[PDB]
């Protein structure tokens, strides 16, 4: 069946903005997961999970009689797809149960793990999501095996179709670097936004880079990919050694015995995959990764035996029974228990990537410290597991249930509690009149509030206007934010604030975060008045101001917009065309195509462009809120051509005289070119549409201003 | 960007059920197009279209000073994609303006035609849809040139994204038959559901079959494709000769001068395509099809000169300036005017497919009658043009505006007017109790109402329970409908009806169409009661009973379900897997994936399978409305394998004992296999889901019963 994708494989794809419709969702449109979860008996679920750990099923028997290691791995894979570049991936939507992640080679036999959880999921129904259950199961596994966790938050709502994520361009699973779709170039530079070394892996190749078993070069890939998942050296060593305290790998015979991944298997397999023709196909004969390593002498119990073994032996390169590279301890006795046969024991073994923790010099110092001070290892792993499994959940206001840790962590981008009366509607009217009387323009007011709010991304629920981080490093210096113009606006708003706060009784005060957003609303109201329309823009107070010490500058760098079509901004030249980058940004802001359309047309005429560029400013009444962008864009009296100097800039000329009327970028003109976008632009550029344009614009403006407002839920 | 479709190209695609979401729609969710249209000043729009006809734009000058021919072709191609096999295609959703149709080769330069209409669309805004405007413009063209049309109905709501239609498997535009994706097999048998001879054509190749200029062989393709668009011989001849009374073709120079179609063109082209490097690229130099034919001596005036020329000359095979085969009149004078140069004249010319009208012997008799009696030609054409342009609009209740023809046509599947009081809620409860006391079972009641209602297809809005056509030929004999069981049910319901109607005063009566649906409602209520649940299933009366004389039996043949997964029914063996056919049926019924899932699980346990097959009947309490289908399907204690006899039938056996518990088809087991469907099945198979299952089942049942109820809007 030939599709539009087949004929025009480079046309823009708008269907990523219309996912997650009420159509695909089986729950009612009033379903609120937070409310269902807050009534769950969480203690009862944990008891059932504890029982499950040692209730072996014959279709996938438990190693050592205990499923703990399998479930820790299941939870670390759920969380492990996270990339800090876009916030996409992670455990927070339960995507491991959908394509493609359900079928990634690195997720082999996690299908079995999820199926073992079906009875519990069934018993508790809508009150616990799959997404929450995968993480909670990991926690229970750790607890069952003697490790005390740092805590747990519920609230990850289930999703019902696959997320649109760019996982890479390779067309072969586990393709090694340098191919026609290589994710690597230069001196082993991994392309943004990717955070894994091969297609279908979580972070790195356990045999070493491109399969070459050198622990030192593996360490370099470990460091780069874990940093791209927001983890530093200490967290990385704690997580890897912590995880590999438990369980085992599975490589009992050749990989060619393993059949189709779940999305390719027959219908009779009922959602499972990787069926194996090697001996019994499971248990003692299991094949998952192809490696055959068991790390400690008590694989079902928390121990300090990982680092005793790593440092206490010298290591020899060898091969598993499937042919994979792995390491065995020189001269050791057979001290490692067998998973099924009490009369067998095995020598200690390690992956190349485990040896990285000893042979990379910076890791070695951390690993030695953890070896000599196991209580520090325990605490570091507990904190890192919490971070790993919660890093994509967003502000602490979304954390549900009775095990949420009280300690505030820097990586949560924390926002102080509000402890004072908030401004009311009379106060807001007074503050808007003050903002307008100060001389700040529409363009300055709109641009500043857009800059503050538009850092939000729905993928990990980071960013937005709450916190007033626009005033702090590094946001205040981002080129897209226009740092000199920004400084002058914030200085005037800070004087307004100081004067209003100084006059109040009781404890009433306004935060700068609220005033930035309020001043943007006044801008939009003034712009509507310039056009002859009487419009009130909704505002909700309650934002608070975070400090510089609560704002990790390195972690904040990934929110920098290097492309923001809403301000017609591009920081450099990229391989991806600018209109694909606009749709990507709309997706992170949670906008539909009609919302993206309205929003961009309105921003153009209000003067939100970076550096006051005229590109896309198709109006003779700038700073007035009108539908001019659409009416002028669609005027067939104008002809467009790319410029000689720059192919990404276009001149719009009167068709009859040749006279220049406008210029635009690709972000501008795509609205008059892409056949779906142009259909939307036509609605807003019609003669009956001016009031609809204004109303829709105010709605989407308000939506963006509130994206991070999880305190108002 | 590698996608799920790239890795698993044969997995089922559920996204076709979730198009047309409120997310992608720029109009508000209360927008009602019918209400906007009913206030349009249609006379004022027609006056503007009339002025447009002779107002040439320089970017695409009008042939002969008149855009009429161009707009008739635009309106004929908008309607000409219709296929009777599935009802997909046609003019009713304005799909010509989206991909792929906007870029089909046969639609070359219609982009210019649509752009000419933008100023009128802009003026009238939401009160006239693009869909309606395309057709209206064609009508006004005809009127302006002296032809009396049969009428016009508004009401085609605009759509906002491409519809998912199977247009063929070819990967090359206009690929000749016999390739690796051939749409032809056997003795030139075109595969259902296609209705064109090549990918990107409307019906046929104007040069002749696979480019061979034989009028006789071309006639066979004309007849076959037009029949597949619901047009007989008379209507076919009227349409082709009627259309080719006007205007001209465009082939002034070689085709290699013509650039990229609209979806492939550069962004600067602003949605237009086929830019030509041949001389001025337009007007006198235009290239569209590559043919260069002008049929009549007054191309901008209705005449009977097409048939005067077709019969008054002998014809010689020749070539256009682009190299296409075409025909020229032997020994004729230069009598045909030139489109731009008043001092030039040309000889009469024809397409191969024009000459089909004279050299096929059945066409020749009709064409001679139309030649001798041009008043008959005019009436046939008017009726055919109406049918062509309205055939996908659905029941007459959807027709809006002041020009709707009052004559009721057989192809409209007409429903008589209701002229008596309707039954009220107390009457409906009395009739339900009488149906249940007759002895009819849950299974008989649900199966009969499902059979009557499930013929609906949202592609052309044909079928549904209104009319009670299930009691007439040919429905009453369709194998899926279980003809002997159906006849017994209808006999009992007809006695109930006769008794209730005989006892009334004051005109009140119940139609059999309403009683069939009410009886199905009683069945569902009883099934809920058998499970321990009291529900009321909504019912809306107002259907009427059509007669056999108002039912075209041949036209009804395309509504026969040959695959109906909801009844576990497959009439024969097909190339396409049965699960793909289930999703295709759900799309025709307008169901989402959650609605399809609920509905199928419920139908299984209510006994709706054809022939009382136990396949998929995963319950020990058949005829009770429970979620047993889902609970049992998802039980990991059962193992499934295909049978030896039949690979499309599966046995479900206890995993521990080997005991046979169930059997199912691919349609049953897909719900436990496909990762998105299994996620939906899990929600309904949870321990907390019984009330949700019942409520959602009742909702989707009611939706299906009401699909054709455009009288209630
Ligand atoms: C450099 C990063 C890492 C690499 C290359 C990696 C590699 C692997 C591989 C190849 C397996 C074997 C799969 C099989 O054949 O069954 C595995 C098992 C496992 N990993 Fe990791 N690992 C990494 C980090 C982690 C982390 C961060 C955790 C958890 C905090 C984790 C916990 C586990 C556990 C518990 C198992 C045992 C599974 C079982 O008992 O079935 N690993 N690892
Ligand atoms: C066997 C069926 C048909 C074939 C093969 C056919 C073929 C074509 C071709 C190849 C063109 C020239 C495109 C160009 O170069 O500009 C054309 C023009 C046209 N056709 Fe058809 N046609 C068919 C049926 C119809 C019908 C059913 C109608 C309307 C009732 C229609 C109305 C027209 C008109 C009005 C034009 C003139 C366009 C203009 O003036 O720009 N045709 N036809
Ligand atoms: Na994410
Ligand atoms: Na249709």
**Cα end-to-end span (Å), chain B:** 43
Contacts of B439 (CB under 8 A, 6+ apart): B492
DSSP 8-state assignment for residue A421 = P
Contacts of B231 (CB under 8 A, 6+ apart): B239, B384, B387, B388
- The whole-angstrom distance between A377's CA and the closest CA on chain B is 39
| Residue A299 near ligand 1, beta carbon < 6 Å | no
Q: How far is the CA of A243 from the centre of ligand 1 (A)?
A: 7
CB–CB of A438/A492 below 8 Å? Answer: yes
Residues bordering ligand 4, an ion, CB closer than 5 Å: B 88, 90, 392, 459-460
Write out the binding residues of B for heme b: 244
Convert A557-578 into a string of H (helix), E (strand) and C (coil). Answer: HHHCCCEEHHHCEECCCCCCCH
Rounded to 5 degrees, φ, ψ at A39 are -90, -10
- The whole-angstrom distance between B361's CA and the closest CA on chain A is 37
Return the exposure string of A447-480: e unless at least 16 CB atoms fall within 10 Å of the residue's CB, then b. Answer: bbbbbbbbbbbbbbbbbbbbbbbbbbebbeebeb
C-beta atoms of B99 and A162 within 8 A: no
Q: How far is the CA of A81 from the centre of ligand 3 (A)?
A: 9
DSSP assignment of A261-327 equals -GGGS-GGGTT----B-STTSSGGG-BSSS---B--S-TTS--SHHHHHHHHS-EEEEE-TTS-EEE
For chain A, what is the total number of helices (H) and then of strands (E)? 24, 12
- The whole-angstrom distance between B682's CA and the closest CA on chain A is 7
Select from A455, A437, A442, A466 the least CA-distant residue to A609: A442
Residue A141, classified by CB atoms within 10 Å of its CB into exposed (0-12), middle (13-18) or buried (19+), is buried
Is residue A21 left, alpha or beta, with left meaning phi > 0 and alpha meaning psi from -120 to 50? beta
Select from B107, B120, B70, B117 the least CA-distant residue to B243: B70
Sheet containing A638-642, strands listed edge to edge, beginning at the edge strand earlier in sequence:
A638-642, A649-654, A660-665
**Domain match, A45 and A28 both:** yes
User: Residues in chain A, how many?
Assistant: 713
Contacts of B318 (CB under 8 A, 6+ apart): B325, B326, B327, B328, B349
| Residue B125, number of CB atoms within 10 A of its CB | 17
Contacts of B397 (CB under 8 A, 6+ apart): B710, B711, B713
Contacts of B429 (CB under 8 A, 6+ apart): none
**Domain match, A65 and A98 both:** yes
Q: Which residue of B23, B640, B642 is in closest CB contact with A21?
A: B23
Residues of B in contact with A670 (CB under 8 A): 267
Task: Quote the crossing angle between the two packed helices B425-437 and B483-502, to the nearest 10°.
Answer: 130
DSSP 8-state assignment for residue A457 = B
**Domain match, B58 and B175 both:** no
A302 alpha carbon, closest ligand? 1
Here the tokens at position A686 are 């019609």
Residue A233: give its domain's CATH number: 1.10.420.10
Contacts of B424 (CB under 8 A, 6+ apart): none
How far apart, in Å, are the Cα atoms of A133 and each of A36, A53, A593, B690?
14, 14, 33, 22
C-beta atoms of B689 and A58 within 8 A: no
Rounded to 5 degrees, φ, ψ at A318 are -150, -175
**Domain match, B385 and B438 both:** no
Q: How far is the CA of B88 from the centre of ligand 4 (A)?
A: 4
Here the tokens at position A690 are 């001016």
Select from A388, A434, A411, A591 the least CA-distant residue to A526: A434
| Residue A286 near ligand 1, beta carbon < 6 Å | no
**Domain match, A558 and A575 both:** no
Q: Check the annotation: does A50 bind a ligand.
A: no
Query: Strand pairing partners for A287?
Result: A251
Q: Could you give the CA distance from residue B430 to residue B435 in angstroms, rounded to a whole number? A: 9
| Ligand 1 site-directed mutation target among A68, A76, A228, most atoms within 8 Å of CB | A76
Q: Could you give the CA distance from residue B328 to residue B213 in angstroms, rounded to a whole number? A: 13
Contacts of A321 (CB under 8 A, 6+ apart): A251, A252, A253, A254, A292
Residue B41, SS3 per DSSP: coil
Contacts of B492 (CB under 8 A, 6+ apart): B438, B439, B440
| Ligand 1 site-directed mutation target among A243, A248, A299, A356, most atoms within 8 Å of CB | A243
Tell me how many degrees the CA angle A549-A551-A557 measures, rounded to the nearest 5.
140
- The whole-angstrom distance between B538's CA and the closest CA on chain A is 19
DSSP 8-state assignment for residue B648 = T
CB–CB of A640/B233 below 8 Å? Answer: no
Q: Could you give the CA distance from residue B326 to residue B313 in angstroms, rounded to a whole number? A: 15
Residues of A in contact with B666 (CB under 8 A): 267
Contacts of B15 (CB under 8 A, 6+ apart): A15, A161, B164
Select from B537, B589, B590 the least CA-distant residue to B698: B537
Q: How far is the CA of A160 from the centre of ligand 3 (A)?
A: 15
Q: Could you give the CA distance from residue B677 to residue B164 in angstroms, rounded to a whole number? A: 20
Residues of B in contact with A11 (CB under 8 A): 99, 263
**Domain match, A154 and A24 both:** yes
- Per the structure, the count of domains in chain B is 4
- The whole-angstrom distance between A99's CA and the closest CA on chain B is 7
Q: How far is the CA of B398 from the centre of ligand 4 (A)?
A: 15
Residues of B in contact with A672 (CB under 8 A): 270-271
C-beta atoms of A26 and B125 within 8 A: no
Residues with C-beta less than 6 Å from any ligand 2 atom: B 63, 69-70, 72-73, 76, 203-204, 206, 222, 239-240, 242-244, 246-250, 288-289, 291, 353
Contacts of B706 (CB under 8 A, 6+ apart): B540, B712
Chain A CB within 8 Å of residue B502 CB: no
Element (H, E) at B488: helix B483-502
Element (H, E) at A381: helix A374-390
Chain B CB within 8 Å of residue A14 CB: yes
C-beta atoms of A100 and B4 within 8 A: yes
Here the tokens at position B213 are 């200029």
CB–CB of A52/A116 below 8 Å? Answer: yes
- The whole-angstrom distance between B129's CA and the closest CA on chain A is 10
Q: Which of B77, B250, B371, B615 is catalytic?
A: B77
Chain B CB within 8 Å of residue A270 CB: yes
Element (H, E) at B527: helix B512-530
Give the method of determination: X-ray
Residue A61: give its domain's CATH number: 1.10.520.10
| Residue A441, number of CB atoms within 10 A of its CB | 16
Contacts of A462 (CB under 8 A, 6+ apart): A87, A394, A413, A455, A456, A559
| Ligand 1 site-directed mutation target among A137, A234, A244, most atoms within 8 Å of CB | A244
Chain B CB within 8 Å of residue A650 CB: yes
Chain A CB within 8 Å of residue B637 CB: no
Rounded to 5 degrees, φ, ψ at A7 are -70, -35
CB–CB of A154/A132 below 8 Å? Answer: yes
Q: Could you give the CA distance from residue B433 to residue B623 in angstroms, rounded to a whole number? A: 17
**Domain match, B149 and B180 both:** no
Resolution (A): 2.0
Q: Could you give the CA distance from residue B177 to residue B183 in angstroms, rounded to a whole number? A: 7
Q: Which residue of B7, B118, B641 is in closest CB contact with A634?
A: B118
Q: Could you give the CA distance from residue B478 to residue B452 in angstroms, rounded to a whole number? A: 11
| Residue A333, number of CB atoms within 10 A of its CB | 9
CB–CB of B463/B541 below 8 Å? Answer: no
Q: Which of A20, A50, A66, A77 is catalytic?
A: A77
Ligand 2 atom closest to B109 (CA): 16
Chain B CB within 8 Å of residue A369 CB: no
DSSP assignment of A471-525 equals GSTTGGG-GGG-HHHHHHHHHHHHHHHHHHHHT-STT----HHHHHHHHHHHHHH
Task: Quote the crossing angle between the two packed helices B442-453 and B690-705, to the nearest 10°.
Answer: 50
Chain A CB within 8 Å of residue B127 CB: yes
User: Is the bond leading into B626 cis (omega within 30 degrees of zero)?
Assistant: no
Chain B CB within 8 Å of residue A590 CB: no
Is A390 a catalytic site residue? no
How far apart, in Å, are the Cα atoms of B23 and each of A15, A19, B31, B670?
10, 9, 14, 28
Instruction: Measure CA B295 to chain center.
Output: 32
Q: Which of A407, A423, A455 lies at the terminal end of a domain, its last residue? A: A407
Select from A245, A247, A243, A246 the least CA-distant residue to A222: A243
Residue B484, classified by CB atoms within 10 Å of its CB into exposed (0-12), middle (13-18) or buried (19+), is exposed
DSSP assignment of A243-278 equals HTTS-B--BSS-GGGB---GGGS-GGGTT----B-S
Query: Strand pairing partners for A317?
Result: A327
Return the exposure string of B414-430: e unless at least 16 CB atoms fall within 10 Å of the residue's CB, then b. Answer: bbeeeeeebbeeebbee
Q: How far is the CA of A195 from the centre of ligand 3 (A)?
A: 13
Q: Which of residues 324-353 of B touch A (CB under 8 A)?
A: none
Query: Strand pairing partners for A327?
Result: A317, A350
**Domain match, A349 and A474 both:** no
Which residue in the block uniquely carries the two structure tokens 């959650």? B594
**Domain match, B653 and B519 both:** no
Q: Could you give the CA distance from residue B682 to residue A125 in angstroms, rounded to a whole number? A: 9
Q: Could you give the CA distance from residue A96 to residue A275 in angstroms, rounded to a whole number? A: 19
Return the exposure string of A404-413: e unless at least 16 CB atoms fall within 10 Å of the residue's CB, then b. Answer: ebeeeeeebb
Q: Which residue of A98, A169, A642 is in closest CB contact with B2?
A: A169
CB–CB of B570/B1 below 8 Å? Answer: no
Q: Could you give the CA distance from residue A84 to residue A81 in angstroms, rounded to a whole number? A: 10
Q: Which of residues 152-211 of A touch B (CB under 8 A)?
A: 158, 160-162, 166-171, 199
Element (H, E) at A664: strand A660-665
Residue A328, SS3 per DSSP: strand
Rounded to 5 degrees, φ, ψ at B103 are -125, 10
**Domain match, A339 and A364 both:** yes
How far apart, in Å, are the Cα atoms of A598 and each of A186, A592, A705, B32, B642?
41, 10, 15, 21, 54
**Domain match, B24 and B126 both:** yes
Instruction: Measure CA A357 to chain center.
Output: 27
Residue B437, classified by CB atoms within 10 Å of its CB into exposed (0-12), middle (13-18) or buried (19+), is exposed
Helices (H), ranges, A532-644: 553-556, 578-588, 593-606, 628-633
Which residue in the block uniquely carries the two structure tokens 């590279």? A325
Q: Could you give the CA distance from residue A89 to residue A459 in angstroms, rounded to a whole number? A: 8
Interface mutation vs chain B, best among A268, A643, A666, A703, most B CBs within 10 Å: A268
Its domain, for residue A149, covers 1-167+373-407
Q: Which residue of B1, B679, B689 is in closest CB contact with A125?
A: B689
CB–CB of A309/A357 below 8 Å? Answer: no
**Cα end-to-end span (Å), chain A:** 44
**Domain match, B678 and B706 both:** no
Residue B248, SS3 per DSSP: strand
Q: Could you give the CA distance from residue A442 to residue B170 in angstroms, rounded to a whole number? A: 54
Contacts of B82 (CB under 8 A, 6+ apart): B88, B89, B90, B91, B195, B229, B230, B391, B392, B460
CB–CB of B355/B315 below 8 Å? Answer: yes
């Amino acid at each position: 069946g030939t599709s539009n994708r087949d004929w025009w494989p480079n046309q823009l794809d708008l269907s990523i903005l219309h996912r997650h419709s009420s159509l695909s969702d089986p729950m009612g449109k009033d379903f609120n997961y937070a409310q269902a979860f807050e009534k769950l008996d969480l203690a009862a679920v944990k008891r059932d999970l504890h029982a499950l750990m040692t209730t072996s099923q014959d279709w996938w028997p438990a190693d050592f009689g205990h499923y703990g290691g399998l479930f820790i791995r299941m939870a670390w894979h759920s969380a492990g797809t996270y990339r800090t570049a876009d916030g996409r991936g992670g455990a927070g939507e339960g995507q491991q149960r959908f394509a493609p992640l359900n079928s990634w080679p690195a997720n082999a036999n996690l299908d079995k793990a999820r199926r073992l959880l079906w009875p519990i999921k069934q018993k508790y129904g809508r009150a616990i999501s799959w997404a929450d259950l995968l993480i909670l199961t990991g926690n229970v596994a750790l607890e069952s095996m003697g490790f005390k966790t740092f805590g747990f938050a519920g609230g990850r709502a289930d999703t019902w179709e696959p997320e649109d994520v760019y996982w890479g361009s390779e067309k072969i699973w586990l393709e090694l670097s340098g191919g026609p779709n290589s994710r690597y170039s230069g001196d082993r530079q991994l392309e943004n936004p990717l955070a894994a070394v091969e297609m279908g892996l979580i972070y790195v190749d356990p045999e070493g880079p491109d399969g070459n078993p050198d622990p030192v070069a593996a360490a370099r890939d470990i460091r780069d990919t874990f940093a791209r998942m927001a983890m530093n050296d200490e967290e990385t060593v704690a997580l890897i050694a912590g995880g590999h305290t438990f369980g085992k790998t599975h490589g009992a015979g050749p990989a060619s015995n393993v059949g189709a991944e779940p999305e390719a298997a027959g219908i009779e397999a009922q959602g499972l995959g990787w069926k194996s023709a090697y001996r019994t196909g499971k248990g003692a004969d299991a094949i998952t990764s192809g490696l055959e390593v068991t790390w400690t002498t008590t694989p079902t119990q928390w121990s300090h035996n990982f680092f005793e073994n790593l440092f206490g032996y010298e290591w020899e390169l060898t091969k598993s029974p499937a042919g994979a590279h792995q390491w065995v301890a020189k001269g050791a006795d057979a001290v490692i228990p067998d998973a099924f046969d009490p009369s067998k024991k095995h020598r200690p073994t390690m992956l190349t990537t485990d040896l990285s923790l000893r042979f990379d010099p910076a890791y070695e110092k951390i690993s030695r410290r953890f070896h000599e001070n196991p209580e520090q290892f325990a605490d570091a792993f507990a904190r890192a597991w919490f971070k790993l499994t919660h890093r994509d959940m967003g502000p602490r206001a979304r954390y549900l249930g009775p095990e949420v840790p009280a300690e505030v962590l820097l990586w949560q981008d924390p926002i102080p509690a509000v402890d004072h009366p908030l401004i009311d509607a009379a106060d807001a009217a007074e503050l808007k009149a003050k903002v307008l009387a100060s001389g700040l323009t529409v363009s300055q007011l709109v641009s500043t509030a857009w800059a503050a709010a538009s850092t939000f991304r729905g993928s990990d629920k980071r960013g937005g206007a709450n916190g007033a981080r626009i005033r702090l490093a590094p946001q205040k210096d981002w080129e897209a934010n226009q740092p000199e113009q920004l400084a002058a606006v914030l200085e005037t708003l800070e004087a307004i604030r100081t004067a209003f706060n100084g006059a109040q009784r009781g404890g009433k005060q306004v935060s700068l975060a609220d005033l930035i957003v309020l001043a943007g609303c006044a801008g939009v109201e003034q712009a509507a008045k310039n056009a002859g329309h009487a419009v009130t823009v909704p505002f909700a107070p309650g934002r608070a101001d975070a400090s510089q010490e609560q704002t990790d500058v390195e972690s904040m760098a990934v929110l920098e917009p290097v492309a923001d079509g809403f301000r017609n901004y591009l920081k450099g030249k990229y391989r991806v065309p600018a209109e694909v980058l606009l749709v990507d940004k709309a997706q992170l802001l949670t906008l539909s195509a009609p919302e993206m359309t309205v929003l961009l047309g309105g921003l153009r005429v209000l003067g939100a462009n970076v550096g006051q560029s005229r590109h896309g400013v198709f109006t003779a009444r700038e700073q007035a809120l009108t539908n001019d962008f659409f009416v002028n864009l669609l005027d067939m009296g104008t002809e467009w051509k790319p410029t000689a100097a720059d192919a990404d800039v276009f001149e719009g000329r009167d068709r009859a005289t040749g006279e220049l009327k406008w210029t635009g970028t690709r972000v501008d003109l795509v609205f008059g070119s892409h056949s779906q976008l142009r259909a939307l632009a036509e609605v807003y550029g019609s003669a009956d549409a001016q009031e609809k344009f204004v109303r829709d614009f105010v709605a989407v403006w308000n939506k963006v201003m509130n994206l991070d407002r999880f305190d108002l839920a």
